[PDB]
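Internal QA ticket QA-208
Title: Verify multi-chain structure generation after dependency bump
Assignee: T.L.

Test input:
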Amino acid sequence: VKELLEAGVHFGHERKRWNPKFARYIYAERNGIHIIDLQKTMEELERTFRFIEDLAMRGGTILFVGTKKQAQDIVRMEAERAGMPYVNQRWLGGMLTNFKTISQRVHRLEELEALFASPEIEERPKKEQVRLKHELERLQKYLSGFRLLKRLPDAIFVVDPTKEAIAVREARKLFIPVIALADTDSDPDLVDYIIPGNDDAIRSIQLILSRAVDLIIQARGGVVEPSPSYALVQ
Amino acid sequence: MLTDPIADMLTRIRNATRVYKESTDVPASRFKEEILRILAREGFIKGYERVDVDGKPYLRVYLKYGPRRQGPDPRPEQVIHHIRRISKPGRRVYVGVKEIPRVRRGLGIAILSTSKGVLTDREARKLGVGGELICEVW
RNA sequence: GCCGCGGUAAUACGGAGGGCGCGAGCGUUACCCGGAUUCACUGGGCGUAAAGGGCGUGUAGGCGGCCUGGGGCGUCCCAUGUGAAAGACCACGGCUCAACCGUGGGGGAGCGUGGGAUACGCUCAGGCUAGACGGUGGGAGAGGGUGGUGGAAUUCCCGGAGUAGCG
RNA sequence: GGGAGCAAACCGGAUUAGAUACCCGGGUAGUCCACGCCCUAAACGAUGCGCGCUAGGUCUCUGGGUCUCCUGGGGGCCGAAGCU
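Actual output:
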């Protein structure tokens, strides 16, 4: 139910690409690759989810971040599969610290939104038309996820945190609990609750993003069926 | 060859604390144990224990640290902010009871060898005795 | 006083009106300490700011791993002698106050004599092996000295061939 | 003592207003050997010596191992904490 799933194809990751502070969380260096202790991870998801659950059942929102290529789509789903916000594309700058001002991009998105098959396109030259269509396009592209939240989250969940170092800063400056799934690659030091394991194989990525939202819904009421994973496992 | 054991001991502590080292060893000496005995009692360490590395006696020192904090840099504050050798081997220092210091206004401590074993600012002061000021701890 | 002011509109010069400070005084000059952690014990430094000796070898000196006792010089504590008066410090009075002036109290580091403590330092005696040196066996190296030797090229001479230039 | 090559000085030709230079043709000490002096230097890592302690990554020289590697000594690069 826990490690039995994970022992399939979901444990250990990087090799001498690492960081020494990830020390307690490791079992062996077989194959010259660093293999992480799951027995320790067990005890971690426990204490991690204790906080996650707590935050869920009190109706406190969570922002999901995953820009890396072998994990983007896996985010778009779980997040919308829990009506919560995400960032699939570029982790923009000042999303949290200058929220005030990034927020005023949504107060342009919805301004364009109220115009997609509407009486004002009658007016305005063909110049603005396709232009604004092409604006909304990317406007939408980046702020699909980021939008559902219109006031600073109580926490953030993330995949490769070294890969989104920018994000971890913004949050941590605002005292916003940081929680994430990280590995040898990255350092535990600066994550308030950590899911230590493989941040690259969609396998290990998905499994962790699955039982993540599941516990969001169960603490909220009424767990459903699982969502897409085996897109093409080869 | 190490010119002063003590000053290195303290340093190794100062050095181990800086990285948040769970424990840290230090070669043994009865006078050191006496020191460390006060360090634990005064609440600067969990404690210590005699140990062995290749036949050679050490003292594993179990360090105590603060609680984890929020904001950027969560690194827990320290139990031992600052630890510094006083009577060094070149410049020895001695004091009668009346001449003893009040470390940090009393929050910290001054340790010292006297004819009656290793004591502290308050103890010695109270005993009514003096000796070689060893070091200051806070 | 230092930064600086004055070249036709000067709050910086000179006068004036006003204003700030102190007041039987107020200014200047000289000199001492201070600010100056600017000779740094308390309390500074030397990669590029001023500061690592061109580099070794070692004398005097400074400093000294772990453990056990003997001594008790350093060191600490106790008593006691000394530490004059005037001064300073605290009280209290005498001049109407004050400045001066008295009375009494409280001590002083130092050094002398006695007793005491032994952790640190020192000192004597013993022991250990983590410092240091030695042993055996191997290894890499344009480390140094002497002696001997190889070829490539520059230059010059002698011989051959060859001609109007070479550089 | 040696002296082929190179070359301060020195001389010629150039260039230039000038050219005691830069470029060209020569050229003396010196450069080399021995022996004895001299004692300086951007004698520079511009970082005195010895010791203990405080993440690792990367490539390299040299040793030792019941040699995918582990260990010791040395030479570079990137960098934790910290210092500046």
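Spot checks passed. The helical segments of chain B are 5-18, 30-41, 121-127.
Status: verified.
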